[PDB]
Design a protein around this ligand. Structure first.
Ligand SMILES: CC(=O)N[C@@H]1[C@@H](O)[C@H](O[C@@H]2O[C@H](CO)[C@@H](O[C@@H]3O[C@H](CO)[C@@H](O[C@@H]4O[C@H](CO)[C@@H](O)[C@H](O)[C@H]4NC(C)=O)[C@H](O)[C@H]3NC(C)=O)[C@H](O)[C@H]2NC(C)=O)[C@@H](CO)O[C@H]1O
Ligand code: NA
Length: 528
């Protein structure tokens, strides 16, 4: 069949390219034929395209597991059957424990392989399900989006919408998180995102005013679904924005399918989705790992018997078609610190796209202004409008100054009659003004002919018109070279006529002494 895409809500189910997968609670997921998957799964994701063996190179591929007992041709035929029913069959890239590591330049070969597989099997698109290191390995965050843009454009030439979806684990969807390169580079290209709201334990989000709402909290599941979706579809609470018409809520089919995240009471989902509809932002569907688990068994060999599709198929399909959120995006805006008097260009690094991913950078306007000749904060607001919508974002620009620094102003002792130059070895620097040594003045003098302690005050003048100042003090001690009688020591023994220096004077012992301080023994004592 032909490239078959979905214009309305979706119930997405992954399909295991393997048999008898073990459950987190000891159950079993059989392989199943595609033709047996419930019709209400209108998107079925073949899992997974990956690197099967590094000896075939870096480019991932898909290899049907023959033990499912579908020949290549029969598998093809069953995809065609789904397509004839108006259902989409995507290829899912990655999965758990799949390492993919591509280098800049690999994009052409990756696109070529996606096209080859797509044309051979009749796939309708690709789901990005990179996990763990594969999300950020080498140049993946560049190569995979680059390849996918090529694939999208290739099929657009013939009037076909090759679907692009993604299945990020939700924690990666913070505003600057690991998936954000895939989301931004593919804005306009992707059909919807179905994040995984499972296998993350106690992770979740903080709602100012209700507290922490965790993905494994079964008492607050309605609030979990509502608030995490609300944050995604509006770009609030530190999440990257995924428009509501493009957000599909990914879930485990049952307790065997994922460690945590199963919805015990489907009412919690119905109500959360209704609340999102009530604020004008209905979601685009649900997704599940997996149709195999939905048709699987538990540890007691009891059948799950399609409970997931029973709970959610009709609820999600019995909804109005999606209404596109046509708001444009701005990229590259970050609060920036600028050194006093440096040049600042408010447009550099900032771009914009309409909701279809067309570049509309030239249409960005900025209000506010920065005065780099004055330290302080300056607030800019960037705006762009397209498609009867507007997006705005602020940017704080802080102008700061750095103090210069002196070198070589350290206390020093010099010998009598030596030459002393107060500027020898003395300098000052500043990162933008450069060498400021010629801007140093010296208050005070050293007289090296006269023993004693001389204070010098160094002043540095700098900045505009040399009206900024900083000061540092230096002590220069001039000492004689003259040989003196050895210093008195409290523990030494002296006898008549021994001489000692103490407290600035030379004293002579008049008899035997130990422990008596010169100067403290009066008019007629041992030291004179
Ligand atoms: C942010 C972070 O680091 N989170 C950690 C979790 O990542 C981690 O648990 C892993 O969670 C992922 C994300 O859900 C999960 O992978 C998805 O989930 C299903 C299982 O629920 C995977 O199914 C397995 O696929 C492999 C083939 O790739 C099969 O070999 C295996 O039999 C499948 N298991 C079952 C029960 O069917 C999917 O591949 C995958 N994608 C989708 C769309 O669902 C991993 O399996 C989880 N890994 C483990 C070891 O549990 C968690 C625990 O380590 O820690 C979080 O911090
Ligand atoms: Na097809």
């Amino acid at each position: 069949g032909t490239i078959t895409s979905q214009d309305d809500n979706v119930v997405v189910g992954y399909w295991h390219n393997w048999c008898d997968g073990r459950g987190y609670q000891g159950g079993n997921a059989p392989c199943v034929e595609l033709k047996t998957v419930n019709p209400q799964y209108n998107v079925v994701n073949i899992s997974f395209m990956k690197v099967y063996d590094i000896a075939e190179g870096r480019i991932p591929t898909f290899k049907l597991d023959p033990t499912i007992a579908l020949s290549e041709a029969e598998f093809i035929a069953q995809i065609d059957t789904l397509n004839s029913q108006g259902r989409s069959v995507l290829i899912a890239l990655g999965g758990a424990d799949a390492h993919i590591e591509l280098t800049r330049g690999d994009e052409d070969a990756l696109a070529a392989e996606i096209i080859r597989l797509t044309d051979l099997y009749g796939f309708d698109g690709l789901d990005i399900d990179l996990q763990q290191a594969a999300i950020t390995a080498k140049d993946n965050q560049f190569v995979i989006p680059a390849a996918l843009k090529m694939v999208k454009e290739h099929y657009r030439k013939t009037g076909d919408n090759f679907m692009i979806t993604m299945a990020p684990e939700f924690p990666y969807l913070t505003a600057n998180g690991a998936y954000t390169p895939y989301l931004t580079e593919l804005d306009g290209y992707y059909d919807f995102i179905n994040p995984q709201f499972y296998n993350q334990g106690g992770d979740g989000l903080w709602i100012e005013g209700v507290g922490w709402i965790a993905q494994n909290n079964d008492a607050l599941k309605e609030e979990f679904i509502y608030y995490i979706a609300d944050s995604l579809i509006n770009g609030t609470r530190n999440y990257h924005k995924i428009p509501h018409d493009k957000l599909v809520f990914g879930l485990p089919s049952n307790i065997d399918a994922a460690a945590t995240g199963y919805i015990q009471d489907p009412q919690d989902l119905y109500k959360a989705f209704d609340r999102l509809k009530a604020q004008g932002q209905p979601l685009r569907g649900v997704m599940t790992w997996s149709v195999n688990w939905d048709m699987g068994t538990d540890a007691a060999n009891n059948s799950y018997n399609q409970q997931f599709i029973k709970d959610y198929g009709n609820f999600i399909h019995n909804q109005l078609p999606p209404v596109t959120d046509m708001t444009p995006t701005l990229s590259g805006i970050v609060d920036t610190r600028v050194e006093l008097d440096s040049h600042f260009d408010p447009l550099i690094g900032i771009t914009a796209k309409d909701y279809q991913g067309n570049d509309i950078t030239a249409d960005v306007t900025v209000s506010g202004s920065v005065n780099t000749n004055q330290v302080g904060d300056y607030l800019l607001t960037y705006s762009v409008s397209s498609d009867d919508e507007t997006t705005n974002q602020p940017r704080k620009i802080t102008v700061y100054e750095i103090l210069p620094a002196f070198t070589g102003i350290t206390d020093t002792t010099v010998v009598i009659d030596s030459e002393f130059d107060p500027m020898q070895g003395v300098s000052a620097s500043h990162p933008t003004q450069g060498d400021l040594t010629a801007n140093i003045t010296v208050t005070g003098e050293v007289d090296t002919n006269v023993v004693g302690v001389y204070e010098l005050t160094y002043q540095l003048f700098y900045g505009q018109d040399n009206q900024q100042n900083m000061t540092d003090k230096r002590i220069v001690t001039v000492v004689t070279d003259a040989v003196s009688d050895d210093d008195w020591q409290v523990g030494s023994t002296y006898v008549k006529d021994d001489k000692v220096t103490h407290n600035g004077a030379t004293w002579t012992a008049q008899w035997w002494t130990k422990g008596e301080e010169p100067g403290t023994t009066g008019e007629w004592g041992v030291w004179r």
